[PDB]
Structure 1
Amino acid sequence: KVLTLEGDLVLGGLFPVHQKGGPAEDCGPVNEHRGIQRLEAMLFALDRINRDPHLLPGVRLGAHILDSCSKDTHALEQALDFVRASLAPTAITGVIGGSYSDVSIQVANLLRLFQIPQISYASTSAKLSDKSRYDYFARTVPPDFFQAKAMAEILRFFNWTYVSTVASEGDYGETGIEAFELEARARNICVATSEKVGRAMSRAAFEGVVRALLQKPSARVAVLFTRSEDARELLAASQRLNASFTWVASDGWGALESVVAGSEGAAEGAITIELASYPISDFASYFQSLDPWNNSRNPWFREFWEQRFRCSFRQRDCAAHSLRAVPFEQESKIMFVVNAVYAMAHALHNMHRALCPNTTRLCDAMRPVNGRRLYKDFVLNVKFDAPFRPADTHNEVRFDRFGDGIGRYNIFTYLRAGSGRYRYQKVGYWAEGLTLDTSLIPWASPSAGPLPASRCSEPCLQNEVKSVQPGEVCCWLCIPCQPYEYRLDEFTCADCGLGYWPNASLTGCFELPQEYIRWGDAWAVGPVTIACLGALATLFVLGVFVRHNATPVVKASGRELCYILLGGVFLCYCMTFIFIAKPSTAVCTLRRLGLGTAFSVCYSALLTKTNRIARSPASQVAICLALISGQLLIVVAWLVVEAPGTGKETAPERREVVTLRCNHRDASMLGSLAYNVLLIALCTLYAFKTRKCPENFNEAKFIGFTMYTTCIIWLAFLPIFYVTSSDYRVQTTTMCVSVSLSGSVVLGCLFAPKLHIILF
């Protein structure tokens, strides 16, 4: 059966009037909502256009509507009539049809070769957008990647990055998940589990997939892009397993009550989206006021009446029923059918205006209707107000550059009313951006967590480091680094140290020079006292040798020997002062030279005292100078053997032990000091053994006592230096006090009684 209407321009149509038949027949039962309602909507739209003075006042739009029987193979042989008419056939200017995606694809493939524009009303396939295969296909409904983007925006709005997408096994679901994954990874959204759901999957398989979803505790949100039956089975399995999830579903779920049928306990909190549309007031009145007696245009109306109302036309008993009494549920795609018909009519009107300006009717320039110009220049470039629009809504009908509709979806939530009833309530819309109100969602109210699916783990980027990957790319495990492990980059902690803590820089370990090289005033007071005592001793010696030449006692002894003894005391004081000074390479060399010279002059004084006791001043001076030269040679040999350095390292956590002492080991210096001390002790022992006591008795006794005290001090200060092995400050203080005691002994030795006698 063919629905044909007379008119100047014929518009093709294709509707799924009959359902799939199978092996028994090509097509069987008549569709009541997708086949009859949409066909009547198209007829109503054509009637309104023909009765519209402002839309084709002279040109009357005809109709050539066929039945696809919900099958693509039948659709091709049905659509092999428009091409025959183009080649009594009536030439058409374009078809307005195609509900199923496969039927629309086949019709677009067939009609592309013959330049016949096609405007679909219910085909949302994502593979119909490329113009490399469909040169004349347009649609009013938006494709599925728009709702995938809407779901991605919804996920980003609630800061849900750890999701778990669930797909389907048929042609619906694979492309949607493939398109959603790219937009999710472009919006920093992490997918945990991805699987496919089949129609043949039994209850055990659904239980297994629910268990697999539950295998991730941190993934409490699931992005469902499946069919209605698969969603219903999944909710049933989740209720059976007592699983809790925040489901974000596509138009497959929408606001249908069949999915939540018998599973109302687990569907709470689901954020489902649906294609936005409004009912048409005029279409309801037009359809309800239809009867088989006063409707002869529709050839399938009698079969629809027989199927919907249980009766037969053989017996006069079908006149009692009426569509007015029974409730009428408007199909959600009626809007799109009317919009497609009006878009085609407006494109035809615009092309007629641009091709037949003077005349108000069909002109000779439009006797052949070419699909190329009408599609490329007119069909795509339509911008008109939608017919039968609501009172204050602003729907607009237009096409993109792929010939697709404008993505406008409604966001629905499965609320739990206080009365106990479960209902769907709209909580926003998605035209170009998400517009959630967050006021009607039950779990959006301020509470202890609005189902936060943050991530696999809590990100750490304030002060810690996040570089541990347990197996997931975007799972961030943060472990605070050690205080000495200063943060230098995002994936490593530098081993520069703890004392070099960056000052809110975290770049290169900005060094902190806050180190205790030496005590400036906390402990230098004692060293200051030692230096003052040394200066006082030097001044006393300076006053001493002025009258030394006059004094016969000093004159009898070596005046040069007394002068070099005073110089050695001054050298000891200077060595103490330089030890008190801050350590450095030059400072370390100066201290080593000072201690070596002090030991050398002490040994020379002991040797010349022994020589004087045994027995000349020139020989003693030469001997002491040779000894000093040899000591200086060995000191400089040690200095060149082990070079001095600065920079000390210690334990972490701000030890502040840097620059404690020169980086050159003093084992050789200590050995040389011990050797010269032993030589001085041997000289003192020889002097004591010598029996020259009767002559120069007081001075000899003083020298012997001084030597004994120096030896005792050395033998008592060796164990403490050996045992301390640390505490550089205390070691320096001990060395300073030892050298001060040595200088005090030197000044109180035989030189002091001679000065006292001279004064008295």
Structure 2
Amino acid sequence: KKVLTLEGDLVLGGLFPVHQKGGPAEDCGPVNEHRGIQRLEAMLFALDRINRDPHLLPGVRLGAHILDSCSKDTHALEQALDFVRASTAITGVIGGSYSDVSIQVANLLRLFQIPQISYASTSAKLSDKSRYDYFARTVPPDFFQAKAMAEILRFFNWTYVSTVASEGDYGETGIEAFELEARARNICVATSEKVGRAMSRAAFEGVVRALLQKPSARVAVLFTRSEDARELLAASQRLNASFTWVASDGWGALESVVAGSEGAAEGAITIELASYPISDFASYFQSLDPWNNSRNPWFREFWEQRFRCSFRQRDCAAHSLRAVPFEQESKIMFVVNAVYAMAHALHNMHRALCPNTTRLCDAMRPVNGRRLYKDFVLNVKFDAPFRPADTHNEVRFDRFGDGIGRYNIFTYLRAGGRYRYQKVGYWAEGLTLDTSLIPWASPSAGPLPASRCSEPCLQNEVKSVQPGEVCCWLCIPCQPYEYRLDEFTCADCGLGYWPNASLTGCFELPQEYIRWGDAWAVGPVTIACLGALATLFVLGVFVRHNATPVVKASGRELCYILLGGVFLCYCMTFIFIAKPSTAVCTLRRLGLGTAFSVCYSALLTKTNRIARIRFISPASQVAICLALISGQLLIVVAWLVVEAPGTGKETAPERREVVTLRCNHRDASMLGSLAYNVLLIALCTLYAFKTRKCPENFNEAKFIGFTMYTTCIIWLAFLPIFYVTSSDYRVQTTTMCVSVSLSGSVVLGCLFAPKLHIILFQPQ
């Protein structure tokens, strides 16, 4: 209901938010001590400085008609009728501390052609000159704050965040640009909330809970007014929640937002417009008292709110503004600039429109607002008022009547104890953060907070993206034989190889075979050596005593061939344990049959000659034995011609199983040669059953039959053991040896023990 009026030739209107938006019962409550009173005193100070300037409007004195908007658009629009009710007359309006108020006032003012310059309105909608064609401002739009915030988020690897925004033209227009800029930097948003004009504490707690619903998103982005930010921070403190805040210029660097909720706000990052303090305004504002500053109608209420006193008790005289500290507001410069800009415009008009006189002129009595705005408002160019030493600034408007984009970045920190605000880098055309000043980001404290949906998969895991969400992937493990060729897919190697340590490689593994130094090779080798030594000893004994009647009673040539066969029977253990080659496989295929053929042929001839006792000479006997041996050899030669002498490396469903080196298919030759021997054995047994006759010095073929029986029992009992363990061929070939050696040892003991018994125990 109050208005500030100062007489002058030309009157400039003003609009400031002196009072905060009251509650339901009352339209307007408490006073704004920083964004209200100080800005108004700045405008008054600029007017006073202009009115004693000889170079700027020497003969024209500027008046003022200042109103209060009370942070509400309807109240501001109701008050704004005073500017247009005259058509005293108002040339232009320096106003706007909010975007809704500015838009509503511009919509009304454009119908009467009244220029308007704003000092704090940063909405992008106002750059459309087809809708708002009477408007200028000294601040940049919100097109660049979204870019700055997106780059700040991208710097710290924050890819999963949450946006809280306010309702109107500042909050939604800013968040749409932030969402576009996030899209252009591969970022992703989880949830979105909005705050209404009328909101209670319970709804704020609901917003906090909705933010807490997603635990992975620990970063909250705010495009909010100061009151909404204060209430949200208070609610978060009450509910004991912890977030890392990134806020717009609504929070700025105000101390009232974080008053009483210091614990919740610590570690936040905020953006503010770049500015400097003015030295004259401090000395001007620190000399004001209610008994001299009569022209301001809202000063006494501010005095009572500030110093907590009352003029009724006559106790407010002691207090003074000098003793208490002074913290100048950020946008004061902008306010001063706006006023000076308008002044300069009018000066140029007065210089061009009528150069004859210095006072006002009959042509310029009713000022034209189209000419003034279109020609002179947008073409102003001067040096900034009260500029700090060694710094250069300038006052200009773009095509859209907007300012220049420069911002400063602040953190809230806990001192060594009171809380203060510090610069952490500029932002002009690209970020320039200095990470040393932020406490939460020096590495002594800990690693930087995290805001990702899903953690990075391991080198052995692969990524399969879930449809509908880029930021979140599910890790998977590859088969143990599989290597990871690319980030989102892995393949398997060709059989015979194994993944590299880095798992981006294929490597041929260790070919495995039985080795000489193994105990499983040592044992059979020792047994074979002992058998060979025993055979040599028996041969040496028979040779040494070759003239005794008992030795002469038996054949000597057949004894020698049988001893040689026994020796070959033993040597095969050693042949069959040797590393496979081009020659060793041939010996493995040959010697088994050769040994059986030699031994069984010797037995056959011995029984044949005893049974017959034609062609009984020691040479007919040698010929028959050699023919019987050569028969088996014929088959081996044929097999060598029929099949291929070679080897093979295999694999099995269990791919881990190493590629063993084995000989080629040996089915037909071995089994057939089996016949070259088992049939011969059967004939020998038959002739032994027929040799029971004509007893010789011995002719106890009861021993040869027993030998054959024991051999059949032996081998025939290896067949169950084999299938039992068809794997581990290295241990598989630890039965063929130990059966062949046993058969040979049975034959040797059977044939030689009675003769040695006679040789030793009796003279005969």
Q: TM-score normalised to the size of structure 1? A: 0.63
Relative distance call for 1:671 and 1:67 in structure 2 (3 A) is: same
The separation in 1 between residues aligned to 2:58 and 2:323, in whole angstroms, is 36
Q: Give CA-to-partner distance per residue, 1:654-702, whole Å, 9 cap, x none.
A: 9775316458586995697489547625632542443345359569788
1:348 Cα deviation after fit: 12
Query: Structure 1 stretch 538-547 or stretch 463-472: which is displaced more?
Result: 538-547
Relative distance call for 1:170 and 1:716 in structure 2 (3 A) is: same
Question: Which stretches in structure 1 are left out of the alignment for 5+ residues?
Answer: none
Q: Give CA-to-partner distance per residue, 1:425-446, whole Å, 9 cap, x none.
A: 5555544555666677665677
Query: Structure 1 stretch 545-554 or stretch 35-44: which is displaced more?
Result: 545-554
Relative distance call for 1:197 and 1:695 in structure 2 (3 A) is: same
Query: Structure 1 stretch 313-322 or stretch 732-741: which is displaced more?
Result: 313-322
Relative distance call for 1:182 and 1:421 in structure 2 (3 A) is: same
The separation in 2 between residues aligned to 1:312 and 1:569, in whole angstroms, is 130
Relative distance call for 1:103 and 1:417 in structure 2 (3 A) is: closer
The separation in 2 between residues aligned to 1:640 and 1:9, in whole angstroms, is 125
Partner of 2:727: 726
1:235 Cα deviation after fit: 2.6
Q: Give CA-to-partner distance per residue, 1:523-576, whole Å, 9 cap, x none.
A: 656677789899999999999999999999999999999999899779757854
1:234 Cα deviation after fit: 1.9
The alignment's C-alpha RMSD in Å is 8.5
Q: Give CA-to-partner distance per residue, 1:409-465, whole Å, 9 cap, x none.
A: 3444445567x7655555555445556666776656776647833545653546766
SS of alignment partner, residue 263 of structure 2: coil
Query: Structure 1 stretch 294-303 or stretch 683-692: which is displaced more?
Result: 294-303
1:227 Cα deviation after fit: 1.8
1:60 Cα deviation after fit: 13
Q: Give CA-to-partner distance per residue, 1:384-413, whole Å, 9 cap, x none.
A: 864422346565667789875444334444
1:37 Cα deviation after fit: 7.9
Partner of 1:126: 124
1:142 Cα deviation after fit: 2.6
**Conserved 8 A contact 2:553-2:697:** no
Query: Structure 1 stretch 517-526 or stretch 128-137: which is displaced more?
Result: 128-137
Q: Give CA-to-partner distance per residue, 1:205-261, whole Å, 9 cap, x none.
A: 222222222334454443222222222332333233233333332222223344335
**Conserved 8 A contact 1:152-1:183:** yes
Matched positions, count: 755
The separation in 2 between residues aligned to 1:460 and 1:318, in whole angstroms, is 68
Query: Structure 1 stretch 496-505 or stretch 5-14: which is displaced more?
Result: 5-14
Query: Structure 1 stretch 691-700 or stretch 638-647: which is displaced more?
Result: 638-647
Relative distance call for 1:723 and 1:410 in structure 2 (3 A) is: closer
Q: Give CA-to-partner distance per residue, 1:478-526, whole Å, 9 cap, x none.
A: 6887866655554566665999554443224323336445447776566
**Conserved 8 A contact 2:566-2:599:** no
Relative distance call for 1:198 and 1:371 in structure 2 (3 A) is: closer
The separation in 1 between residues aligned to 2:310 and 2:715, in whole angstroms, is 133
Question: Which stretches in structure 2 are left out of the alignment for 5+ residues?
Answer: 612-616
Q: Give CA-to-partner distance per residue, 1:16-53, whole Å, 9 cap, x none.
A: 99999999999999999989987996797799899999
1:173 Cα deviation after fit: 2.3
**Conserved 8 A contact 2:462-2:475:** yes
Q: Give CA-to-partner distance per residue, 1:259-285, whole Å, 9 cap, x none.
A: 335544533444333333333334667
The separation in 2 between residues aligned to 1:177 and 1:75, in whole angstroms, is 26
Partner of 1:374: 372
Relative distance call for 1:501 and 1:304 in structure 2 (3 A) is: same
The separation in 1 between residues aligned to 2:735 and 2:371, in whole angstroms, is 106
Relative distance call for 1:551 and 1:456 in structure 2 (3 A) is: same
Relative distance call for 1:487 and 1:416 in structure 2 (3 A) is: same
Q: Give CA-to-partner distance per residue, 1:97-156, whole Å, 9 cap, x none.
A: 766546767999999999999975433113456899889987532333433344444445
**Conserved 8 A contact 1:700-1:750:** no
Relative distance call for 1:310 and 1:668 in structure 2 (3 A) is: closer
**Conserved 8 A contact 1:100-1:122:** yes
The separation in 2 between residues aligned to 1:642 and 1:428, in whole angstroms, is 84
Relative distance call for 1:114 and 1:664 in structure 2 (3 A) is: farther
**Conserved 8 A contact 1:34-1:331:** yes
Percentage of identical aligned residues: 100
Query: Structure 1 stretch 301-310 or stretch 578-587: which is displaced more?
Result: 301-310
Relative distance call for 1:719 and 1:60 in structure 2 (3 A) is: same
**What does residue range 601-640 of structure 1 map to in structure 2 within 5 Å?**
611-614=608-611
The separation in 2 between residues aligned to 1:649 and 1:303, in whole angstroms, is 98
Q: Give CA-to-partner distance per residue, 1:69-92, whole Å, 9 cap, x none.
A: 999999999999999999xxx999
SS of alignment partner, residue 262 of structure 2: coil
Partner of 1:405: 403
**Conserved 8 A contact 2:148-2:427:** yes
1:335 Cα deviation after fit: 1.8
The separation in 1 between residues aligned to 2:349 and 2:686, in whole angstroms, is 133
**Conserved 8 A contact 1:12-1:94:** yes
Partner of 2:507: 510
Q: TM-score normalised to the size of structure 2? A: 0.63
SS of alignment partner, residue 655 of structure 1: coil
The separation in 2 between residues aligned to 1:380 and 1:686, in whole angstroms, is 134
**What does residue range 686-701 of structure 1 map to in structure 2 within 5 Å?**
686-694=687-695
SS of alignment partner, residue 501 of structure 1: strand
1:181 Cα deviation after fit: 3.7
Query: Structure 1 stretch 128-137 or stretch 165-174: which is displaced more?
Result: 128-137
**Conserved 8 A contact 1:698-1:750:** no
**Conserved 8 A contact 1:499-1:653:** no
**Conserved 8 A contact 2:512-2:661:** no
**Conserved 8 A contact 1:464-1:478:** yes
Relative distance call for 1:67 and 1:685 in structure 2 (3 A) is: same
**Conserved 8 A contact 2:493-2:499:** no
Query: Structure 1 stretch 603-612 or stretch 162-171: which is displaced more?
Result: 603-612
Q: Give CA-to-partner distance per residue, 1:697-748, whole Å, 9 cap, x none.
A: 5697886676566446535655655666555334424433544555567788
**Conserved 8 A contact 2:247-2:270:** yes
Relative distance call for 1:103 and 1:740 in structure 2 (3 A) is: same
**Conserved 8 A contact 1:166-1:195:** yes
Relative distance call for 1:281 and 1:740 in structure 2 (3 A) is: same
**Conserved 8 A contact 1:255-1:424:** yes
